[PDB]
């Protein structure tokens, strides 16, 4: 009994052609709807809980898409774009996804026509290149101008980017903190320096910016409460080496005939630890931190001689501290000298919400700070942290590039007008694709107004009419519920965000539309 | 859920390729069965029997399928067989190869409809060409008819019995012509009954100038042999029958019961002398016969046969020219069974049969097939069906065509000329059809077992 | 808060309805236009059914989602009213729904869209009646052939379209009928269609008369009658019952025999009364007993049993015979009159595909038309009879309404731009609905091109360009044109090409599509109930 | 019923195939299945593809070899042609597309002859002789024997063909960057090894911003400072940067008191001495794949030394080649001669990714790296695959020489010449050679189908214009003009060796698959 021989595995799914492509477009639209509501000064956030039961709320779309583990292949590309934009420029990852989906949405009716996708993607590439050039032309610098403080642009940039996430009504506050903080980051510019500290409890209006380093951590040994916990003008000693009785040092068997020699051996071990402690004290410092655990006895000696100590401190915060007080971490206690000894304006350790924290700050030459982030919700901790991370990284980009553009979708409207006018010049099939490009691009204000509950058709129509002639930076104003020169209203976003957004969306459309069929393997 | 919840769908080039594959397979499973060199195929039926036959139609009819286009082809084969008898030895093969070349233009992205129009033009030209290359032939001349039959049958098992087969078919068909249509009389192939009786040899089978009845004399006394019988066809039952209108009887006096009992007897008698008033010899009915009426007819020395199939009754009537009658009182001498050269009842072995032969001008006839065993006999009768079918087709059309693929090659080069004079996109499909035709002679060659390529080239050139 | 099922609201259910409508559209999107490719259905058990006529597909396709059922019923109604456009109307409905939703999918208030749609339909039908073409000047048979063969493409028989159109027009002109005293109404389905596998449609024959799918009752009874003595009889022929309850009781046995005797003699005398008239042909839906058969043979007449009632009614209408449910008179006695007889030149049973069917040729009272199909399988034959039924439908529409429309999508070709211009007049928001109506309605050329597999955007653009030119320089006697084709993949003049469609097709199509859009668009929530 | 017979029960449950039925129908059908599978693949108008593996990993692809690698196939001769194309890719680069199309066409046309009854063995003879004749005639088609070794312009123009083939949007950028790569790499370890180019994937900052470094890169952290010296002194150590632990279980032992003090102190002192000696030779940066002792990094910080970590063996090999300094398994001897030399080394941020950069200038020759930037990592996979295929193309170019006119034109000339030789063949194999010649129309056919223009008259016009010796004219890529284009001016070229090898391998695959008649298949 012979049988026909199969080509591929049993159940190898296949689906080819226009139905496959339109299915992909619909899937992208579905992904969009999961995020459509999100962006807006009156925008939105989602709550997603995992199978493990841990809740997670988010307003940044990229985080949400990470949580929405997508199985369908095409949408995985969109979620990857979300990761890309998140690593690049920040909010508008939301906007990025909406642009991608809407590009696909406008193209799909023409895909119903049997157009070879490559024509579509060629038009897309040309349009995107032209759009990027237009943005760069209408980019705005300030250091040419006169009425800019080197921070005012940064402050307003934070102002704009923030006012969609969970802390929107404290923007006038958080912008000042984040700008002043990032001003200290120079010139390493990397996020690892400034940690974020999710202290439980408290109203986030009470969240603290310290020109120094703090710990949410400690660990109880014998005397840790005994030693004084104020040090007005202290010297910081930083030990990586542990302080304990050969606890985890080199493993060795020892042999001793004379009992007195055995006595001498135990004495010599304790003399090792005493020698280390004497080196520490005679150093003249009073504060000692250690990655590795601290012997209780050494704690006792610090207590007796009024030195403060702590053990098991997480390494990242230790690096923060050493970069703060200027001292260098040490592993050899013997080679110690005053040069590697960090100094701080004042040291403390004060209760916040039941937790035992440590403080030292006021170091005039400290290029790294930290956020004590009060808040009554554990979920606020992650959400506020995400928002703050977006703020920090976007303001870093802004410092790097003195280029700003108006917000409120006005950029998108300007691009729409420019591209539509350009479309008249090129005859043939390209014209319709350019038109669809503009019609998809205009989506951003529409979603804004919809989440604002307005007649975005009146808004859009007035927008186009006024924006044909009257000024570049007119766009949606949420509170006045109509057009405004958002630029003067200080809705200021770095150009890089929108530029990268458009580029990513363009190549996303290229990728998706450049697919005809799909093969699945069990 | 949107559409139907467990209804599959498939689309486009995949569907076209799948259907073409199905058609090609359908053709392939039969490509060996054609030609005088043909193979011999036998079947396992669902319910136990054994069927062996060359005829493609039966072969396919014993095929169930899942893919639909295969079922379509099955029906096509059965239709062609019904209409003409043979050619089904070739029709599905030709269709399959037609399709196989046809698909080659699908990946040309050539849309089907234009190819279809090309096919229609091709059919028109093929019909014209074949009509140009016919030969009219006399219909009365017997030996040419026999030659035609031999030609049309020398593909199946009966070949070695060609002389007997041709004589049988000619005799049967020739003597079946209902001239009551003026000069437009029509023959029919449901009065040419075929009877399969085992034993004997093919050589023993012969045309009986009459009918065969697989029944027996009801009573010993009726003579089993009669020279010039008279035959009466009683469609009605010959016995006492239910009062159809739910009648009832309420007797009170003693004699009444015995009297009503006598009454049905008397009615039976009435029918009996009504029959015998016409001096018949033979009584036939599709219904039962009362043993009392059997008595009376015996007293009149009249042979009676009971409970015969209605079609058999019709054939007997057409044999002895008499017409069926359902009312004995309305019996007419015009329906007396005149025209029976001999009435007889023989034994084939463990079974009586009825022979009614030597009619004056019999118009009905059944063929007596006597061979080896019922399955071979069935093959024989299928072949006979095909032969007599083509014979009747000749008696409808006296035009003949040279087969053996010759007509096919004529059509081939004719269409080639038309194509090279017929520039256009449809040209390629047209010559594709032409080339597809060439495969009947090809298959002949492989079934022979010769150099197919060189032989075909020599043929075409 | 309802048990046994959840509910869906707003965007979810809107998108679901559009999704279903698009599904249904794509089910048939490949079977329209002179390059349409037919569908076929492996049922569940092998009894397949090839067909391209959309309404047939929808009926034979099981459907569960509500809106899809709505569309299916719409297709069925359209078939009950036109015959084709089930090629089209479903697509129109789905596309209008799609674009209307796309407007609503943004925010746009549905009732505004509905009002815009209503205006669009009214404007469109008015513009069509300003775009009409009248056939009265045109040659009758000419335009009839044109409309027929136009419908014949996209079907199995489009290739033989010329022959088939000839046959169809002959039949329809032969089925003339005088209506309400002022109308020459032509009855569809009056022409009889019989399928018979075997020879090709090339050999499919038109019958100048009527044809029966019946057989001779008695083999001995003759086969052909050159005389016109045709009597109809609903009244069945059996040795009669007592027919209600009449028990027969015997107290004098001497009469049972005579009782039984007349139990048949009643039918005997009825038959003899029938035959003494000289009628040689009888038909009967009721049963026919052998008693009657033998009598007929002895008379040599013609007898047929178990004929369908519609067929014999048509027989009476053709031959001029009278349907007779029984024998009776203004006086009680049961008699029969020769005036009841109908006539036809010759009646023959003939063997087509070794099955004998009964023919009736040239009834003198009223000319009848029947058509025999010849084909390979039953699949091709019954799908082509569906096609022919659509043919007769459209020709009936043409005759009933002396008015024609240029085929090949010139309709929406004009309509899109005309409605585009008219949109700006309203000034409200509804002109957006108007524009979307036009753009969606532009779907027909798109589907045409894609099924013809060429650059669809370019063909559509050229079409729109030609029509827009037809809306510039109002001296349009040399600037108004109309047309679109596929076989050469470029525009033409369908008026010259003969590609015509009946007006009522597009009119009723657009109206029903508008109603369907109004119904489905007003949806904003389904509530499910798991069964009892 | 229900019980036919078997005259051979030899099999315990398996597939026996025989009677040429499998060769005539089933095997051919499988090959045609593959042909349809990747017919859309090749073509500048060819559009990309995605597939997920059995382990649910995405693969956006246009290359045929990669996609075949991701379909776990079961029909045997399917595997035949698959792995044939696979090895072909292992040899030349692109052509997987080519060879699979060749196989499909040759098989499809051969089965037609088999049906018309030609001897299978005779089909073999005809195909073999045709392939050999085509090989003979091919060199007569070479034009534009591009000879410039290390110019950027010629090589950019050349590599444009493959890049354009597997990516139609971004020819200019990829061309210039890969050309910069090729010219930057000289013959150092022998004739421009493909392995000499490394590829890194960095998401964000779409494709246009991708760049190339004349050094080599690492996505790893750093342990001390971040500095670059215009005279950067690099030390390499395969051994873990720590005191050399004896492989034998060596437990340090003590006997009296002062042993503890002196032992810990001496450990400290001699780590200090070792790292100092390293610093004494001026080496400011050290790399190792082995474990790093905290003491060592501490002292390195004291002496301002750079550290690089967790490198795999291949990675440190790359770095060795980059700085040309010999890795030292012995921790001690920072020898002057085998000690590193780099233009600049630092740490930078791209895409929220710590990146170690060895920014370099090397006249003697260095193994450079290309930096890929953009959103979608799947697009990175596709684009880097295409770039590597182009690098292979450039390598094959360097192997010998002799660009040939692509765009099917070469193949049309092949068809015409082979046919012409066909009518001078005569013998029953004439049909075999004629069909083989016909088979080459598949390529222009495929270009048409992915181009969506009516193939037949395109091929006809191509033939007609090829009747005048215009060997440089080929299939255009333009809807407005679905007619023709002259390849040479358009610069749409390709390699002699690639076409030759693809043809030979396709021939071998065909002759193998046709040859087998009956099959045996044990249950999997």
From Swiss-Prot, chain A:
<feature type="binding site">
    <location>
        <position position="498"/>
    </location>
    <ligand>
        <name>ATP</name>
    </ligand>
</feature>
<dbReference type="InterPro" id="IPR053374">
    <property type="entry name" value="TCP-1_chaperonin"/>
</dbReference>
<keyword id="KW-0488">Methylation</keyword>
<feature type="binding site">
    <location>
        <position position="498"/>
    </location>
    <ligand>
        <name>ADP</name>
    </ligand>
</feature>
<dbReference type="InterPro" id="IPR027410">
    <property type="entry name" value="TCP-1-like_intermed_sf"/>
</dbReference>
<dbReference type="GO" id="GO:0005829">
    <property type="term" value="C:cytosol"/>
</dbReference>
<dbReference type="GO" id="GO:0005737">
    <property type="term" value="C:cytoplasm"/>
</dbReference>
<dbReference type="GO" id="GO:0005832">
    <property type="term" value="C:chaperonin-containing T-complex"/>
</dbReference>
<dbReference type="Pfam" id="PF00118">
    <property type="entry name" value="Cpn60_TCP1"/>
</dbReference>
<comment type="function">
    <text>Component of the chaperonin-containing T-complex (TRiC), a molecular chaperone complex that assists the folding of actin, tubulin and other proteins upon ATP hydrolysis. The TRiC complex mediates the folding of WRAP53/TCAB1, thereby regulating telomere maintenance.</text>
</comment>
<dbReference type="GO" id="GO:0016887">
    <property type="term" value="F:ATP hydrolysis activity"/>
</dbReference>
<feature type="binding site">
    <location>
        <position position="408"/>
    </location>
    <ligand>
        <name>ADP</name>
    </ligand>
</feature>
Swiss-Prot record, chain B:
<feature type="cross-link" description="Glycyl lysine isopeptide (Lys-Gly) (interchain with G-Cter in SUMO2)">
    <location>
        <position position="8"/>
    </location>
</feature>
<keyword id="KW-0067">ATP-binding</keyword>
<dbReference type="GO" id="GO:0061077">
    <property type="term" value="P:chaperone-mediated protein folding"/>
</dbReference>
<keyword id="KW-0991">Intellectual disability</keyword>
<protein>
    <recommendedName>
        <fullName>T-complex protein 1 subunit gamma</fullName>
        <ecNumber>3.6.1.-</ecNumber>
    </recommendedName>
</protein>
<feature type="modified residue" description="Phosphoserine">
    <location>
        <position position="236"/>
    </location>
</feature>
<feature type="modified residue" description="N6-acetyllysine">
    <location>
        <position position="215"/>
    </location>
</feature>
<comment type="subunit">
    <text>Component of the chaperonin-containing T-complex (TRiC), a hexadecamer composed of two identical back-to-back stacked rings enclosing a protein folding chamber. Each ring is made up of eight different subunits: TCP1/CCT1, CCT2, CCT3, CCT4, CCT5, CCT6A/CCT6, CCT7, CCT8. Interacts with PACRG. Interacts with DNAAF4. Interacts with DLEC1.</text>
</comment>
<feature type="binding site">
    <location>
        <position position="89"/>
    </location>
    <ligand>
        <name>ADP</name>
    </ligand>
</feature>
<keyword id="KW-0597">Phosphoprotein</keyword>
<comment type="similarity">
    <text>Belongs to the TCP-1 chaperonin family.</text>
</comment>
<comment type="function">
    <text>Component of the chaperonin-containing T-complex (TRiC), a molecular chaperone complex that assists the folding of actin, tubulin and other proteins upon ATP hydrolysis. The TRiC complex mediates the folding of WRAP53/TCAB1, thereby regulating telomere maintenance. As part of the TRiC complex may play a role in the assembly of BBSome, a complex involved in ciliogenesis regulating transports vesicles to the cilia.</text>
</comment>
From Swiss-Prot, chain C:
<dbReference type="GO" id="GO:0044183">
    <property type="term" value="F:protein folding chaperone"/>
</dbReference>
<dbReference type="GO" id="GO:1904871">
    <property type="term" value="P:positive regulation of protein localization to Cajal body"/>
</dbReference>
<feature type="modified residue" description="N6-acetyllysine">
    <location>
        <position position="396"/>
    </location>
</feature>
<feature type="binding site">
    <location>
        <position position="501"/>
    </location>
    <ligand>
        <name>ADP</name>
    </ligand>
</feature>
<dbReference type="GO" id="GO:0050821">
    <property type="term" value="P:protein stabilization"/>
</dbReference>
<dbReference type="GO" id="GO:0044297">
    <property type="term" value="C:cell body"/>
</dbReference>
<feature type="binding site">
    <location>
        <position position="33"/>
    </location>
    <ligand>
        <name>ATP</name>
    </ligand>
</feature>
<dbReference type="GO" id="GO:0000242">
    <property type="term" value="C:pericentriolar material"/>
</dbReference>
<feature type="binding site">
    <location>
        <position position="408"/>
    </location>
    <ligand>
        <name>ADP</name>
    </ligand>
</feature>
<keyword id="KW-0143">Chaperone</keyword>
<dbReference type="GO" id="GO:0000792">
    <property type="term" value="C:heterochromatin"/>
</dbReference>
<dbReference type="InterPro" id="IPR002194">
    <property type="entry name" value="Chaperonin_TCP-1_CS"/>
</dbReference>
UniProtKB/Swiss-Prot annotation, chain D:
<dbReference type="InterPro" id="IPR012721">
    <property type="entry name" value="Chap_CCT_theta"/>
</dbReference>
<feature type="modified residue" description="N6-acetyllysine">
    <location>
        <position position="461"/>
    </location>
</feature>
<keyword id="KW-0206">Cytoskeleton</keyword>
<feature type="binding site">
    <location>
        <position position="97"/>
    </location>
    <ligand>
        <name>ATP</name>
    </ligand>
</feature>
<dbReference type="GO" id="GO:0005874">
    <property type="term" value="C:microtubule"/>
</dbReference>
<keyword id="KW-0007">Acetylation</keyword>
<dbReference type="GO" id="GO:0005832">
    <property type="term" value="C:chaperonin-containing T-complex"/>
</dbReference>
<dbReference type="GO" id="GO:0002199">
    <property type="term" value="C:zona pellucida receptor complex"/>
</dbReference>
<dbReference type="GO" id="GO:0044183">
    <property type="term" value="F:protein folding chaperone"/>
</dbReference>
<feature type="binding site">
    <location>
        <position position="96"/>
    </location>
    <ligand>
        <name>ADP</name>
    </ligand>
</feature>
<dbReference type="GO" id="GO:0005524">
    <property type="term" value="F:ATP binding"/>
</dbReference>
<dbReference type="GO" id="GO:0005737">
    <property type="term" value="C:cytoplasm"/>
</dbReference>
